[PDB]
């Protein structure tokens, strides 16, 4: 029994220490991957254009609103899902 109990105790020690090591390593990976994902989504959004800037003159019922934008002028536009 001495062999058996001694070796399982040893195994427990190394396993727990390496579990803490794994905690550290996994945390580092979970920060690096998060950062990489952040950068990727940033670039994907960076591909999208500048969407203009305008001011509304008169709402004219759901799905249609009038807005004036620099010298493009005043345009009527359907609102999005919001």
């Amino acid at each position: 029994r001495q062999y058996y109990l001694s070796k399982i105790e040893e195994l427990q020690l190394i396993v727990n220490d390496k579990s803490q090591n794994l905690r550290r390593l996994q945390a580092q990976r979970n920060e690096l991957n998060a950062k990489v994902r952040l950068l990727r989504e940033e670039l994907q959004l960076l591909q999208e254009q500048g969407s203009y800037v305008g001011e509304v003159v008169r709402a004219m019922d759901k799905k249609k609103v009038l807005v004036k934008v620099h010298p493009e002028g005043k345009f009527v536009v359907d609102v999005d899902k919001n």
């Binding site: 058996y4 399982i8 195994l11 390496k18 579990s19 090591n21 996994q26 990976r29 690096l32």
Partner: protein, 32 residues
């Protein structure tokens, strides 16, 4: 029965080793 638990802990150690190696490889790949 203690043979079973000792072997289970041995497999736990080997699995943690696998995890550590995979995490090192993923760390290098993620850095690149």
């Amino acid at each position: 029965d203690l043979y079973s638990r000792y072997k289970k802990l041995q497999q736990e150690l080997e699995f943690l080793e696998v995890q550590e190696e995979y995490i090192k490889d993923e760390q290098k790949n993620l850095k690149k």
